[model samples]
Structures are given as C-alpha cells and as structure tokens.
Target: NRHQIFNTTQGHYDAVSFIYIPIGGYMSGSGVVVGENEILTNKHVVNGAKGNPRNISVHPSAKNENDYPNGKFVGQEIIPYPGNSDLAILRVSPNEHNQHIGQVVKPATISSNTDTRINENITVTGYPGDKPLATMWESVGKVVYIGGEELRYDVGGNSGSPVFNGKNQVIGIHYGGYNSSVYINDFVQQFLRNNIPDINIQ
Candidate 1:
C-alpha cells in the first residue's frame, strides 16, 4: 500500500531505500544517501540484528530490482545510542555491477543546526506500511512543536527518517511518531561515531 509518490522513486536510492533487515521478516524504510558510500536509517530498521548485523541489503533506484535479489542480505555496523537516539549507518558491500556504478554514494546534505520555530513547516519521508510496496517522496507532513532537543511534527512511519531544514540539510533524525518529534542533530552526533575506513584507498 505504498503511497503514489513513492512509485516514481521506488528504484532510486536517495528517494527510497530497500532495506533488507532480518528482524521481523524483510522491512523497507526510506533513506537519504548522505555520503558517497553512506546510508542513514533508523536503528530499529536494523534493531534486532545490532552488534552482529548480517545480510543487510540496500537497493538504489538507478539499478534494476533483480540486481539485488530478494533475501539477499548485506552486513552492517551499529552506532550506539542512549534512550532516544536510534540512528545507524550501513556500509553497502560492493558487487560487480555496483562497483562500476560506484556503490558508495552520498545522498543530500545533513543540517548541523536548526532554530526550532513553532508552526514551522517540515517535510518527512519514510517507508510507511500505508501501502503494499515501499514508496518514495510519497509521504508528507508538518511541524507542530519545537523543544530544545526535539522537533514535533505531524507524520507517521517517520522512524529513522531524516528531517530537513530550510536548506534541505538534515537537521534532525525522526526517531518515532509519538507527537511526531525529532531528535536534534546535537543528540544524534553523540551516538554517531565515524570509525569505518575509506574503501577507496583499500
């Protein structure tokens, strides 16, 4: 029951990400490619498989669906967080086809700072179960409140979705839909530790 908006970007990586997580069957979530080889998604997307993530797959829009067959899993490493910061990064493995296309891709820019303003408009994107297949750019919502560390919005399936600022930079990462609040960039950074090596030199 994916929204109509997602149909066009279904195959696109920045628009919609086909997440192959082995927690409760296969789950798909919308992700923005922030780095050449980096993908940002919810910690829950890879929740059950933390510490030892195995067989996780991410499908970009440019490639054919069959290129990444169903049940084909990839490996991932998790970023530790306390109670609210539930964000993680996955390093997509290189394949013959992907290598040619440069598997490591960057999505959009993430906003480092944002001044919360009440009644301010915000956009949310994610793989909500509101449809049959996953959708891209199909979801939309608005902001309702702004706290010191969280921004509340009116949307669902936003878990792990990136909240963009006025400049289209990611200012917050949607953790859940309880009043539709977002964890500020500051809190998110505390959990994110960049230790992954650059594959280019290797």
Candidate 2:
C-alpha cells in the first residue's frame, strides 16, 4: 500500500480529522484541529452548498470505520476565510451525548511564518477517501514549490491535509488536489487570529 496508517492519539496526528460535508455527493475530506473547538479545512469542502453545521460531522484520529479516538463531533459554525482564500474553519458542537471535540485531543501546532524551504522533506497526514473509510493515513513528499501562500505536494486525502515540516510544524494546508496546498501565510494567520478566540497559531 502507498499509504501508511496514522493511528496516533498523540502529537499532531491526534488533531487530524475525517471531515464529512455535503458538497456534491457527501464530500469526504480531511481536517486539522487548530484549536479547542476549531477544525480547519478547504473552503470548497464546505462551499457551494451552504453546509449546515448540524448536518456536518468530524471524526478525529479515526483509525477505521469503527475507531474514533477522540469521538465524533457535530459541527457548529462554518466560517470561511474573509478574503479570497481556500481556507475555512469549522467549529465543533456537542454531539447528542454532549461530547465535544476538545474533550480529549488538542490542536495541531501551526507555523505562522511560511519559511518552509524548497525541497524540504514533509509529512502529510489525513484520511484518504479512496482507501478505507475514515481511516487515518500519511505520506512523505518533498516540497517542490513554496511561494505566495502556496505549496506543492502529494499526500493522503485532498482537503485539509496538514503539510508538516520535518520538525512537525504544520507549514501548509493541502486542499483539493494532492499536489496543491495553501501555505500557512498571512491570510491563514489572519483567518485564525481574526476568527477564533485565544488560538495558538505560531
């Protein structure tokens, strides 16, 4: 298999989530937990459908169809980046059992400065839909490009995959295709800073 299992309930991997939204026909993508209640993903993932938070769901650190390390969470808010960007943030709401996403897992450490070097090796983590459902997966790829809020890569899943540097700092958020991602740039910085309260976007 070209993909590797990412079953950690520790570190950044714990923040990775399986996002389920209804775009065209039940959009299955990846997401990163950026704060106590915020999950980051691509705008397109929740766009074009006026996605209701109540209808959307997230599975953090999902290892299989049945394993949910952090428990399933209901979405509360669907906040898109104010400016022209492919970024969006989903706030987690309490499930029927009153369970919250922040009850167990913490947020991923995101880099504010886009100083990722070209050719630098990176690790991308998320749940690839083509494989097993809701299963966490990872892939290693070298940065082929990095400029103006954009980076290049191939990794597990398409949307909301965190492109982590060798130091385990998230340098970008992969969206749509496996080869493109939005760098954790000023827009990204501003999106989190202006939207979420008391977030740690380093």
Candidate 3:
C-alpha cells in the first residue's frame, strides 16, 4: 500500500534517481543524489566483481520514459561501506560537460538521527524493478522498530530507494521489499563522510 508523490519539480523526488547497472545480468535500482558527484545506493546494486563497476548509468530525477530532464551519467568510482548494512556511494560523471549531477538534480540532505519515533511517517522514492522505465514512484509508511542500526517498518520497500522522514530529509535506505531498512547509522555516516569531500548531513 502506497501513494503517488512524484513532484516534477521538488526537493525529494528530483533527488531520487534511476540507476542502470549490470552485474548478474542487466539490473536496475534507485539512488539518492547527495553531493556534486556523489550518489547513495545499496551495496548490492553496484557491487562489481572484486568491487569495481565499469558499466553504469545514473539517470537523475527520471519522471517517465519521456520526462527525464537530468540526463544520464556514468559511475566513475564506487565505494561500498564495510559491515552488514547494504549501503554504497557511487562517484558519477556527467555526460554534459561541466554539468554535475548536483547541478541537474537536487541533492538530498542526509540525516544523522539514530532515533525515530514509533510509527514515524517515512517516505520512499525510487524506480522499483516491477515498475515502468524511468518512472518514479513513492510510498509513505511508518516505522515499527528501530534497532541494530536498522529500521523495521510496515511500508512499501524497494531496492535503493531513499527513506525520507517527514521533513524530507533522507535517513535510511530501503533494501528488502516490505521488510526492514538500513538506517543511516554511525558507520554509514562515516562511510559517506569519508568518501565525499564535503557531504551534507544533519
């Protein structure tokens, strides 16, 4: 159960992206634009053999087949976080000269809140595999449990979807469908801070 909240010109929705990658056959996922050239996604999405992804495309703020205005880009480098959480950061390069992904799309502000209220309203935005091409969908739900640096919720989950709190600040990443989510824990925060020269988190 979910609702449609795709804003053609908004903060959270435009920050969301469609990731075209290949590992075990052609696969796709969603991601969050976090910095000038930084994108946040699941470790399982772009993890290549020996951890190096060569062929990858990042389509930012894709609304539908004919409505993607951000243009496509490629992954220049990738860094998967250590430990159990399925989190990763992709360093992407723009196809258009001098137009960074941050310039084309909105970069969502990260949140470091380790604690979320029970039944807290959480929003998700991404391109799930079951959906159409370049289309963006979103769902709103509540947090049921928070522990082990993860959030167990009763909501629509999709691979690489950005989990946003009520304020539209990104706080976690959706992994398992209709299961738990990887909260932006300390380890993930450090991982982002380490890779991005100047990450935006609060």
Candidate 4:
C-alpha cells in the first residue's frame, strides 16, 4: 500500500512532478525536476508509446485537476542517454515569466553516487495513476537489496518516481519495483556537465 505524503518538509513535493503523455489515451507517470528546465523520468513513461512532444505535459505540485499550482510545462525535446538505461531526460518549457524569475518550479538535488546498501533508509514519492489525479503518494522503506544497477522495494505504481536518501537527495529514478536508474556518477553527471553546465547536480 502507498502512503500519502501530506507535507513537503523534505522539498520532495515541489520537485516531484506528474507526467501525462497523450499516447493512445493518456499515459501517466511520475518525474522530478533536476534542472531549471530538465525533468528526469523513465524512457518508457514518456517514450514507450512514441508520444509526441507537443502532446506531453508536466505538472509540478499538482494536487487535483483544478489545482495546478505551479502551472503546466510542455516537453520541448528528449535528451538521449545510454541505451537500455530505462531513463530519459526531458527539456521542458516552463512559463516564460517563471523561467525568467526562476521560481515556477523547484529542482531536486541529485545524489553524486548510487552506492546504496541494504537496510539504508529511503523514500519514494510520486503520483500514481490509480490514485486521484495529481495526488502525490509516498512509500517509506529501506533498500531491501541492491543488484547491479537496480534497487528493490515494495512500492508500486511509482514508475519514474524519485527515490531519496536520508538527506532528501535524489539517489535514483525508480522504474517500477525492480529497476535501475541513470545514476549521477554514471552518465547523468557528464550529460548535465556538457549540456547543462548551469544546472547543479549535487
């Protein structure tokens, strides 16, 4: 079962995002802002159905259909990383004014490494499609196990969710229950370093 995250004391609410891709009908998933205009999610979440750029939208801090407090953003383009990583980077176009002022949406602090151990405290937050629209839920658990690039947890419907360490820094981009992420020490750091030098990944 998923627990509702009632507060943003850890700043996860602001950074966590609800993704909607107009593929077939509407394919929903979770994402997190990692840069001023960059969102990280699973490739299957957005590209699984070959969604069109213009038809995709990201809602930050959305609680309900009528409550898009941070407005809505459009995905501009897809940033490619390594193959089979199940990770995708979306460059979004936020409200022009908000983009200029730099406060429309908050970005997450990415962990510099993925060296997690069993029993490590971790929290996963995201908007599950089965739940109310834009309703953010969380699953608090520990790293049950770590194998290769994947971390196992009991959470569900959190595909593309952000997994955070005790410091509240994002350590992984979850893809379902058993999955791997584009770690900061992997290609994410170098990708951002070369393409988005202004965005800080810490």
Which 10 residues in a row give candidate 4 its minimum summed lDDT?
A: 177-186
User: Relative to the unseen true structure, what is the C-alpha lDDT of residue 156 in candidate 2, on a scale of 0 to 100?
Assistant: 45
Each model's TM-score? 0.70, 0.89, 0.90, 0.86
For residue 49, give model 1's deviation from the true position in Å: 2.8
lDDT of each: 0.51, 0.77, 0.79, 0.71
lDDT of 3 by residue, 98-182 (tens): 7899888778988987556668888788886777776788877778888766877774566888999887889888887446778
Candidate 1 lDDT for residue 37: 53
Q: What is residue 75's positional error in candidate 2, in angstroms? A: 0.9
* Model 4 residue 71 CA deviation in Å: 0.7
Model 2 lDDT tens row, 1-202: 3465655687678888888766547778888887767888888876633767766778888888777766788788899887666788888886667755766677777786546678788888887778777877888888887778788764344578878887777888888553888888876787788877756766
Reference-based lDDT, residue 110, model 4: 76
lDDT of 4: 0.71
Error of 1 at 128 (Å): 1.5
- Model 2's TM-score against the true structure: 0.89
Instruction: Give the winner by TM-score: 1 or 4.
Output: 4
Q: How do the residues 113-192 of candidate 1 rate in per-residue lDDT, one tens digit apiece?
A: 54656665566655555544444443455677766567776636545666765555565666675445445455554444
Best by TM-score: 3
Task: Using TM-score, rank the candidates from best to worst.
Answer: 3, 2, 4, 1
